[PDB]
Structure formats: structure tokens, C-alpha cells
């Protein structure tokens, strides 16, 4: 069995190996990468996503989200308070202001310490979930706006044609902006490219151990767990590495830098935070190996998780017994 300790693997594809996206994902899996739940892919030196980032300031962040925490430093939830629209140039200036900027630090480990000590005492503003792309149309390799769609994958594997579309999303971050513990919708893969700026630190639980994280979460967030049998779908709960270690939960960590891709694998729980002003692009995707995870994915039906148009068909075809309850949660 490859990668039996479920370590995060780092790949350095050549320019030739960077041509065929599906083939390379399958290669990484042949080496056991999926066992970690997360892999890093460093693009060949010949590749670029676009020529420059000099002309992005006029992108609008229609609904910046202030991420307000409740709880204790290592075990907290966050809610998202909607703020007034602002441009990416305005948001960058805000990220760099004295109130929001990254503090002085020694290295990534010192910054990580500071994050977990102090995150709850601040409310950073995240420009998350913006439909769009920063890949140049002429970038042919690993262009997250040109991937095979999940609807096409389902059709190819299962024979059923379905409605829906699959487009990327931009994330503008600042120091302390946080992504809560989650798996993807329908336990899909994700791919995330850090276009520019400061790093993003990731934490991940191996897919084979995801239920250990869920059991801890039910213990640590007992009201939320009574409310919903899949409350991690709400994407609000944070648990620190220290707390995970105290509770024996297997996990790994890694820091993504600008110019690097991360892939999350089906049912790989992940969480993390941004080091300072940055911009990432991410999209969900599927492979043949995903289908069995999609059929077994948990679902939130309490109403909170509220998701895209395109999840309807996935539930309807892969999970027909759950469909009626889930759809009630959507309405
Ligand atoms: O970058 C973020 O805020 C969150 N990203 C993801 O969870 C992802 O790419 O799957
Ligand atoms: Mg612009
Ligand atoms: Ni994710
Ligand atoms: Zn729910």
C-alpha cells in the first residue's frame, strides 16, 4: 500500500507531465497521495497562470465577509457578517492597514503559533467565494476554468446526462482569514491555486480517518451536533492542531505559497488560514474514483448548509433515498 502513513506528498511534474490533468491526478493517486487528503503540486518552471497580476484591482468583492469568532482559542466557531462592497484594490489596502496586517514574525511556525493564540480576538475580512477566474485563456495546462466538468464525469461514468455547471471561485484573503473544517460538497475533490500574495496554511485529516474528526467535533460542539447530523457542512467550526493532538486525531499540515497548487481528495477534511493579503482560485472536480464517495457523502438537511444549483442533480442521481429530505433543507 503506497503512503501508508498518509503523509502529504509534494509533486514536481515536468512540462510534459503537466499536459494531461486527469492522467496526473491518477498518477498521484498511484503513489498514495490521496491517503493524506491533500497534495501539493509545484508547476514546472516553464508554466505560468497569466502574465502579470498588475491589473486586478478593479475586481469587485460584492459581499466581503467579517469572520467573527466565538469560543476558546483552540475550539471556536465563526460567523460571517456581511460588509459593504469593495474593490480588490480597496481590500488590499485594508489588509495592509495597521488593524489587519500580518504582525512581525520569525518564520511560518511563529506565525502559526500567533494565529492559534490570537485568532479569536480579531475579526478579519475575507473576500471569499467570488465567481470568476484569473487564468489567462491561453494557459492550456492546469487552467482551473478549463477543466472537465463534474456533470460530464457523472455522465461518462454512469450514463445519465444532468443539468448544472461547474465554475471557479476567487478568494481574496488577509491575515487570520480562516477556512473552517470541511470536506467538499458531495465529498468532491478540490483544486486550489494560490495566484499571488502571502501563504495559506492547511490542516488535513486522512480520508480513512475522517469519522474520528467528526466524532471529536460532535463532542466539542455539542449544541451544533444536536441541531444537525452533518453540521461540519455548515463550515463554521475550528479546532486547533494542539486540540487535535490532545485527542489523538490523525492530521497533517503544510503551507502553500504563491504559484503552487493544492488538491484535496474526496472526504479529506481540511481547514486553514491565510498569512496576509492573497488571492486564490479554486474549483471542485471529480474522477472515476469519486463516484463511490459521492454516493456515501453525508448531507445537511437542517437548512443551514445551502449550496449551489448543481448539487441537486448529484444528490438526485447518486443519493435518491436522501433526495426528498435534502431538498426540503434547500427550501
Ligand atoms: O482557500 C480557502 O479559503 C478555502 N479553500 C478550500 O477549502 C479548497 O480549496 O478546497
Ligand atoms: Mg481589475
Ligand atoms: Ni475546501
Ligand atoms: Zn445542517
**Whether the CB of 126 sits within 6 Å of ligand 1:** no
- Which helix (H) or strand (E) covers residue 40, if one does? strand 38-41
Whole-number Å distance between alpha carbons of 239 and 213: 10
- CB contact set of 187 (below 8 Å; sequence gap of 6+): 266, 267, 290, 293, 294, 296, 297
Q: In this structure, are residues 270 and 190 in contact, taking their beta carbons and an 8 Å threshold?
A: no
Q: In this structure, are residues 272 and 200 in contact, taking their beta carbons and an 8 Å threshold?
A: yes
Q: Please check if 182 is assigned to a binding site.
A: yes
Q: Please check if 192 is assigned to a binding site.
A: yes
Q: 181: burial class by Cβ within 10 Å (0-12, 13-18, 19+)?
A: buried
Technique of determination:
X-ray
Give bridge partners of residue 41 from the DSSP assignment.
11, 261
Domain 1-331: CATH class, spelled out: mainly beta
And the C-alpha cell for 236? 463554521
Whole-number Å distance between alpha carbons of 117 and 121: 9
Angstrom resolution of this structure = 1.2
Q: Which long-range contacts (CB under 8 A, 24 or more apart) does 108-112 make?
A: 108/199, 108/201, 108/255, 108/275, 111/275, 112/201
Q: Please check if 209 is assigned to a binding site.
A: no
Distance 207 CA to ligand 2 centre (A): 38
C-alpha closest to that of 284 among 158, 108, 150, 93:
150
**Whether the CB of 224 sits within 6 Å of ligand 1:** no
Residue with cell 471561485: 169
**Whether the CB of 179 sits within 6 Å of ligand 1:** yes
Q: Please check if 279 is assigned to a binding site.
A: no
Distance 286 CA to ligand 4 centre (A): 24
CA of 87, nearest ligand number:
2
Q: In this structure, are residues 218 and 165 in contact, taking their beta carbons and an 8 Å threshold?
A: no
The structural domains of the chain, with segments of one domain joined by +, span: 1-331
**Whether the CB of 202 sits within 6 Å of ligand 1:** no
And the C-alpha cell for 264? 484535496
35 DSSP assignment: G
Amino acid at each position: 500500500a503506497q503512503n501508508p502513513n498518509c503523509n502529504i506528498m509534494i509533486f514536481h511534474p515536468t512540462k510534459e507531465e503537466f499536459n494531461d490533468f486527469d492522467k496526473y491526478i491518477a498518477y498521484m493517486e498511484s503513489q498514495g497521495a490521496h491517503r493524506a487528503g491533500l497534495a501539493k503540486i509545484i508547476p514546472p518552471k516553464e508554466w505560468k497562470a497569466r502574465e502579470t497580476y498588475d491589473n486586478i484591482s478593479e475586481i469587485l468583492i460584492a459581499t466581503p465577509l467579517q469572520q467573527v469568532a466565538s469560543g476558546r482559542a483552540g475550539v471556536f466557531t465563526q460567523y460571517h457578517k456581511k460588509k459593504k462592497a469593495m474593490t480588490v484594490g480597496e481590500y488590499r489596502h485594508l489588509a495592509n492597514s495597521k488593524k489587519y496586517q500580518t504582525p512581525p514574525h520569525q518564520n511560518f511556525e511563529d506565525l502559526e503559533r500567533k494565529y492559534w493564540k490570537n485568532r479569536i480576538y480579531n475579526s478579519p475580512i475575507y473576500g471569499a467565494d467570488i465567481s470568476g477566474s484569473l487564468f489567462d485563456e491561453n494557459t492550456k495546462q492546469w487552467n482551473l476554468g478549463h477543466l472537465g466538468t463534474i456533470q460530464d464525469l457523472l455522465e461518462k461514468e454512469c450514463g445519465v446526462v444532468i443539468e448544472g455547471v461547474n465554475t471557479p471561485y476567487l478568494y481574496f484573503g488577509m491575515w487570520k482569514t480562516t477556512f473552517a473544517w470541511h470536506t467538499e460538497d458531495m465529498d468532491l475533490y478540490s483544486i486550489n491555486y494560490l495566484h499571488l500574495g502571502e501563504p495559506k496554511t492547511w490542516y488535513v485529516v486522512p480520508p480513512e480517518h475522517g469519522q474520528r474528526l467528526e466524532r471529536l467535533a460532535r463532542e466539542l460542539f455539542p449544541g451544533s451536533s444536536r441541531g444537525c447530523g452533518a453540521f461540519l457542512r455548515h463550515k463554521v467550526a475550528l479546532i486547533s492542531p494542539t486540540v487535535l493532538k490532545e485527542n489523538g486525531i490523525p492530521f497533517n499540515r503544510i503551507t502553500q505559497e504563491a504559484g503552487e497548487f493544492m488538491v484535496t481528495f474526496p472526504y479529506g477534511y481540511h481547514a486553514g488560514f491565510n498569512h496576509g493579503f492573497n488571492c486564490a482560485e479554486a474549483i471542485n472536480f471529480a474522477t472515476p474514483r469519486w463516484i463511490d464517495y459521492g454516493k456515501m457523502a453525508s448531507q445537511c438537511s437542517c437548512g443551514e448548509a445551502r449550496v449551489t444549483f448543481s448539487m441537486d442533480a448529484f444528490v438526485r442521481i447518486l443519493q435518491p433515498e436522501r433526495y426528498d429530505l435534502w431538498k426540503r433543507g434547500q427550501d
